[PDB]
Amino acid sequence: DWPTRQVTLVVPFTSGGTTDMLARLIAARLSEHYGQSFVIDNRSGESGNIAASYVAKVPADGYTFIIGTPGIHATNRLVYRTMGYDPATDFTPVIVIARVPNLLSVTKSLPVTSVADLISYARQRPRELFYGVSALGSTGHLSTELFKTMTGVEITAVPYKGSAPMLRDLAEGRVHLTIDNLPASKPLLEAGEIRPLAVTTAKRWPPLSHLPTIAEAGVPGYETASWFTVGAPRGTPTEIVTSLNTTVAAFLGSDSGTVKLREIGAEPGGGSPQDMQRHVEAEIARWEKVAKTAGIAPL
Numbered sequence: 443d444w445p446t447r448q449v450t451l452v453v454p455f456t457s458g459g460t461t462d463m464l465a466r467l468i469a470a471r472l473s474e475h476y477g478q479s480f481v482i483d484n485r486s487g488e489s490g491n492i493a494a495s496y497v498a499k500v501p502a503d504g505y506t507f508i509i510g511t512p513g514i515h516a517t518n519r520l521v522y523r524t525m526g527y528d529p530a531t532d533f534t535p536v537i538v539i540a541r542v543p544n545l546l547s548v549t550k551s552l553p554v555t556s557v558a559d560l561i562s563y564a565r566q567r568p569r570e571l572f573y574g575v576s577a578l579g580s581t582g583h584l585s586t587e588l589f590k591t592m593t594g595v596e597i598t599a600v601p602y603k604g605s606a607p608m609l610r611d612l613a614e615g616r617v618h619l620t621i622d623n624l625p626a627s628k629p630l631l632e633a634g635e636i637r638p639l640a641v642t643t644a645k646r647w648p649p650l651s652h653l654p655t656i657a658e659a660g661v662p663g664y665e666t667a668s669w670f671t672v673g674a675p676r677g678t679p680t681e682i683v684t685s686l687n688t689t690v691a692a693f694l695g696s697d698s699g700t701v702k703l704r705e706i707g708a709e710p711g712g713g714s715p716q717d718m719q720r721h722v723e724a725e726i727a728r729w730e731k732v733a734k735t736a737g738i739a740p741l
């Protein structure tokens with residue numbers, strides 16, 4: 443019987459970022475499978491805290507879900523003092539949608555063609571260059587802060603409300619570089635508007651197999667990545683979480699779905715609701731260490 447009416451997917455960022463891109467794919471698929479609209483509600487604000495506060499409070503009926511992010515589940519606690527919700531108690535896991543490499547890029551007029559170029563360039567100019575942050579506490583933000591710490595470069599963060607506006611500013615050179623999710627960056631690469639230097643992952647991204655990893659390009663042992671989830675309000679019927687998990691997992695593990703995800707710069711996730719929970723718990727732990735090492739904590 444579920445669902446008999448429209449389902450809402452609350453997305454914590456505006457369109458043109460990776461969250462929204464993934465959500466739309468998922469929404470399209472769910473709508474076709476179940477014969478009801480799965481509609482996106484883009485509710486921006488405070489690195490996803492506004493959307494996560496919202497979905498924590500809604501009826502646990504299976505007509506509202508959160509497209510979760512590393513901020514919401516794991517990293518916002520490293521930069522926000524109080525959040526409005528407790529991710530640990532307020533949600534129940536559904537599925538990890540994807541794992542996503544981050545990409546180090548620079549604005550075209552920055553005369554650097556490699557990670558080592560970038561490090562020398564920035565070392566000559568301490569505290570003059572600016573980097574773009576898609577959201578406070580995002581993996582990009584903390585990835586850049588870690589990069590800073592591992593290389594000794596001093597560059598100043600500019601927060602934006604999502605990937606989309608940060609990337610327009612990166613294209614114009616109002617910031618000089620970013621580390622941010624591949625899928626949102628990729629259209630700007632293909633169009634020539636920004637210059638990619640390296641992926642953040644431990645291995646190269648196969649469809650851009652000739653971009654090096656940051657680790658092999660000069661920063662031994664550097665590795666970061668981002669990921670996205672479906673979460674439900676605490677108390678959501680188990681039959682619903684299991685049906686939803688199964689449907690998403692069949693899309694992600696299908697040949698067709700893997701192709702769609704890899705075409706936009708994302709690796710299909712999949713697995714069980716408890717797999718999501720393990721992943722979240724490990725991410726909490728490991729980014730908490732990153733943040734301490736990078737000098738990042740709530741004001």
Ligand SMILES: O=C(O)CCCCC(=O)O
Nearest residue numbers: 459461580581604605668
């Ligand atoms: O969807 C966006 O625009 C931003 C997502 C940032 C996710 C992350 O923390 O890497």
